[PDB]
Amino acid sequence: ANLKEIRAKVASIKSTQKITRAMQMVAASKMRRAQERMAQGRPYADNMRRVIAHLVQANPEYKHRYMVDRPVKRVGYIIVSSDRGLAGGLNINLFKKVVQHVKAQQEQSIEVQFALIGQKAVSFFKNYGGKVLGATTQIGDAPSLEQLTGSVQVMLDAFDKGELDRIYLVSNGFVNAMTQKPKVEQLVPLAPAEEGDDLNRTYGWDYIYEPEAEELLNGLLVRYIESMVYQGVIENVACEQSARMVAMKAATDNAGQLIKDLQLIYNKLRQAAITQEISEIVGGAAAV
Amino acid sequence: VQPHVVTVLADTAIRADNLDEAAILEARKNAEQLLANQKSDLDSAAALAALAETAAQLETIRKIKNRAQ
Amino acid sequence: DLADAQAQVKQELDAAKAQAAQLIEQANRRAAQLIEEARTQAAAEGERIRQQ
Amino acid sequence: DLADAQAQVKQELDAAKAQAAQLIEQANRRAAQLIEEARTQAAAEGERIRQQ
Amino acid sequence: QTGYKSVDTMIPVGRGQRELIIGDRQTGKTAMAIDAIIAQKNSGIKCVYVAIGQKQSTIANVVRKLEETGAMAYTTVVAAAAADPAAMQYLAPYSGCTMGEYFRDRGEDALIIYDDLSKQAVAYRQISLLLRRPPGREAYPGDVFYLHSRLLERASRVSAEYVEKFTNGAVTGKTGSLTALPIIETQAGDVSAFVPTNVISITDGQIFLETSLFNAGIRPAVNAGISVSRVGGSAQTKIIKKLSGGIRTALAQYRELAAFAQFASDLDEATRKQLEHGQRVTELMKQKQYAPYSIADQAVSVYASNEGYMADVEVKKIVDFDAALIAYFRSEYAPLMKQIDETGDYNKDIEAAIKAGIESFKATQTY
Amino acid sequence: VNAGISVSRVGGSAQTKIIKKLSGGIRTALAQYRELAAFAQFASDLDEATRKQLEHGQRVTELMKQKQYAPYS
Amino acid sequence: LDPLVVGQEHYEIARAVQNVLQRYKELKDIIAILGMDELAEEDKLVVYRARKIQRFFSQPFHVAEVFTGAPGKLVPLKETIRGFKGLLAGEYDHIPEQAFYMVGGIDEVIAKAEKL
């Protein structure tokens, strides 16, 4: 038979295996880079929560529309996905969680709204449809908050109309260096959670409010939400990197298995061919 | 500001003398943009291609395994 | 500061001059084997003189 | 310091000219030597051709 | 000596050793043999070329080219072209071996080269078949193993005591030798074919030719990854014996991890530097026919390699860099290379002179 | 039929004017579709125009179905 | 194919055209996957030059008696060397490949490009 082609197939598979190995190493480097990237966003949110808590403990006389909670009629949802697949089934189980949750909510007769990030999810929910108003791609590994800004403002204004009452961030929590899980958590409705905790006194010192404290606090909430979105994007990007790395490893392993399979069959076939040809020769020689 | 620590939560800031340095922020912007191009230019080109040819013609082999002739 | 920067230009000019040197080296070195081949043919001409 | 800088400018341009001379004479000499050896070897070739 | 840096470094060849060139077709194998022949201007050995089943046109082209080199003066050649009786072809290599053994038994050292031992095996197959002999696998009478083996072993390096006793006192100092360089052509690069399989266990070392490399324009197209020479450095000069290891290990590392060509836009820097080192040194061996490198040339190239003084220049002009360096030393420092190839010894004075010349060259005229 | 390998050295010389006039783009589309076989299972990240070519190939492929004993004028 | 027998220039032109065509071939897949834009500006001119090469190869036959009018070309090797040298350099890498189609030397290509 065409044994040389079989050997060529083997060689191609070997090459593919090495390429997968390279995929894994590149993914590892990207993982470490993004893992570094996560930590840099801490002090911003840390200090900003600190000062917001200082404000609210200094001014409990009123609240903010983002600090308040009224009965929910509709919700907005924000999901972040890759531009390209192949990175595990992070999009898969993400979609599973979101669809079961949305079904849980519609039987509560509450509508669901969306702004989309990541081409895969973009398609996944365009085909389903839904009440989507935002869509973005070309995020890259280090996007600009500018890029998120349009969408996030869309959710902001929609919440201001009172149409949307809860907004949930949908991403994948980086559980550890290998395993990560999807996470869907409401963010626009906020309740005191370390906003009424981690405090033991209201400081007799306070800042003077050069602009109106109300508008100042509003701009604050703006920045805080945007930063939350940004770090979530970072985390899910890292999770994508992890999943891609693992999938490449598995691909290498399957390649090795198939290589064994082909090699064994090749040995058998070579033996058979030799037998056939020698039988032919001896019969032909015996003819005379 | 506090009597001992002061900080700015920057919407967007750059170590720079003037907005003329906008010619500099776009440098890193397009750098990361080029990297974003690169990740696809390798990912699909490496993964999708090679893996595509892998399972492609394997069937004609698996069907002729026990061939005695 | 400007004068100091200016001296550096002279070094570049010198480098260009050195680079031309390679041009001439190659060009006239070619002529050697040009002569070699041409009067190698002249040796072939002595040869068919010998053949006559 | 500016006067010193001018003096330095001359102190560099003269050396630039000098190294220019060095490189150009070296190239010329090498090429001539090459053409020399070349035609000598090709002459050996021609005589052996006639001997053939 | 072969004038081939890869060959002379990773695959040393000693006087009296059996080493096999092998590969697929139209791979310059003929060119490899003839160029190896050319490098014998100074070796003082003699050489014999055995051609089997060839187009007289090709034969005559080789003849004319050799005559141009003039080396057909310490050389003799016989050819069993494709228009010849099969028996003539079958016996011819034995005759060539006979002429070689003449000088070997004269205490002399020489080199001989076969052509297409496979072809003469085919001829022998046909002859035996016409004798109504019992055929073997692929119609090959079994003694083909015996046939080839009884030929190859006739060439070696002999004990000078044998020389002396054979001469009966005529000569006493030297020892005879004869190095065997056969060639085998392969079908699609198989090694499992019966005849090559027989051949393999016979030689003292083997060299493969990979079609893709020459198709990739890698001239020569030797795959060092499998080509070996189990005789060790004993077939190199002391200086080359010293300087081979850098190439050895760099080429290793490269060939395990060459896959990253398009990669390493995010990888660690040490990998990038080692990759550049490997790419450069790999390119270094690209070489043209009829352009043998003297061991001094190879020496300066390897020194510049391991000194990393080419680890700062672009890959596309490495060959140009090398040629320029070659000419530069050849002119400026002729006595040094003179002494080198007189002896081929590594000394601190020598390497210091070499490095001084290199850094001068870099300082002097550019490439 | 596997058009990838079955051919005739005769060519359109044995075809009437109209059918030879028409068969060209058909053969081209078949060749295109055959070209993109290995990626046929990934119509999610390719070019849109490539998707159009694939869809055209699919339609013409189905166009090549026919029953038995049912020849066409 | 050897410089000693064909000269150096023709040999090296052949080398370069081999390289450009084989490199264009291996990019076909990724071009199909994404498109020309996502490739660096490098090799776009390579794609154009390869296409123009393929067009340049289209040679009307001298003797078919009926394929395009049976026009002979038998262009000199030197003229074709000139044309392919210019194309490799890019002397005309600004013209639609169609102008290089079904023609011979640069004269025909330029005349066709101007007539259209």
Next chain:
Amino acid sequence: LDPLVVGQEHYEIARAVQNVLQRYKELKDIIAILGMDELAEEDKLVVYRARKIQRFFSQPFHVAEVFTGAPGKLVPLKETIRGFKGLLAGEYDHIPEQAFYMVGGIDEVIAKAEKL
């Protein structure tokens, strides 16, 4: 290789060594790619212990004496067994790998280690 042949304890010891060497071998790839300090410290202990094992299995040879000096050492069982068992116990995890290299019995190893 059966407890009915080399005895019970010997068999189990050998099996344990095999397990350790395997375990470290599949550890190797992760050590290469994902760093080293991202794993169980017990796994790191395994790594060190396996490295000691490999360092130890080589030995000087009485034939190597004429080759490169360094007279070889003859060693029977019941010391190799004991030393390896103690290594498996981890009682020697306070010593660099060097004491195991080019050396005879565990007594020699400890002699070198103290002297190192």
